[PDB]
């Protein structure tokens, strides 16, 4: 559904990777990036392990837009190309798809969503973000609103439904 496209700088090549996500507030808990096999970046400047033969590390990282931190870029068979761009960032702590990836390839787990008691959680007092620098202390809905403004003001991302 409605989401946002984020432009990641790749340390390896001149082309920048553009991922689509429905949960931009979890960007600070990102452990890695990953693309499908049929992605332009794969065939452009990179194959024996990919074509013949879970995911494979490209050898290059991507610069995290809001942290002095690099994330490993992967090419996995589980990644779906059809849905939008076919490129995503993995949040192990709040996604079982991304966790099983991080568990196998020893990628770090960073939780960023402090969940509240269930009776009060979803009604109004949405879970509190943390480990997210400026997003700390505010709710998920407020985090998703603010983080999009940071992406748009700095030319990093734009709204896409």
Numbering used by the authors: 221 to 266, 271 to 277, 287 to 394
What does the paper say about this structure?
Here, we report the discovery of potent boron-based compounds that inhibit an unprecedented target of Wolbachia, leucyl-tRNA synthetase (LeuRS), and demonstrate that inhibition of this microbiota target is an efficient approach to arrest the growth of its host. The editing site of LeuRS plays a key role to maintain fidelity in protein translation by hydrolyzing tRNALeu mischarged to noncognate amino acids such as norvaline. Altogether, these experiments show that benzoxaborole inhibitors of Wolbachia LeuRS are prodrugs that, in an enzyme-independent manner, form adducts with adenosine substrates. The adducts then bind with potent nanomolar affinity into the Wolbachia LeuRS editing site and efficiently compete with the physiological substrate norvaline.
To unveil the structural details of the inhibition mechanism of Wolbachia LeuRS by these compounds, we performed crystallization trials with the protein in the presence and absence of inhibitors and AMP. The architecture of Wolbachia LeuRS consists of six antiparallel β strands that form an extended β sheet with four inserted α helices, hence adopting a β1-β2-β3-α1-α2-β4-β5-β6-α3-α4 fold. (B) Crystal structure of Wolbachia LeuRS D1 editing domain shown in cartoon representation with key secondary elements colored as in (A). In addition, the region 313 to 318, which, as judged by the high crystallographic B factors, is highly flexible in the apo-structure, becomes more compact in the complex and makes interactions to the adduct. The new high-resolution crystal structures presented reveal idiosyncratic features at the drug binding pocket, which rationalize the selectivity of these Wolbachia inhibitors.
